[PDB]
Design a protein around this ligand. Sequence first.
Ligand SMILES: [Cl-]
Ligand SMILES: [Cl-]
Ligand SMILES: [Cl-]
Ligand SMILES: [Cl-]
Length: 105
Amino acid sequence: EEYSGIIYVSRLPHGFHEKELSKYFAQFGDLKEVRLARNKKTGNSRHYGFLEFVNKEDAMIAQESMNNYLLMGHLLQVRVLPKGAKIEKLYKYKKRVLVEKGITK
Ligand SMILES: [Cl-]
Ligand SMILES: [Cl-]
Ligand SMILES: [Cl-]
Ligand SMILES: [Cl-]
């Protein structure tokens, strides 16, 4: 009851973008949305993103499997976000703001 179907994903390795997010995470259930954080001017990846699953059960399973998955010298971090999370709103925050709000912990 207390969690959304949305995950925050970070410590992405070089070359790991929206297509790789989809490829790795769609294996756990159908996806409603995949977003990679990018500098709005240069287009450069900020090396984290947000995904939403159609079934929030699947978000829990993806988080359990992909959190601390070691890929290309990176330990992927995955967090299921509490109820009320909305990618449309969270995607707008500066990275340091997500960190201050405790969303990335
Ligand atoms: Cl970081
Ligand atoms: Cl990095
Ligand atoms: Cl690393
Ligand atoms: Cl972390």
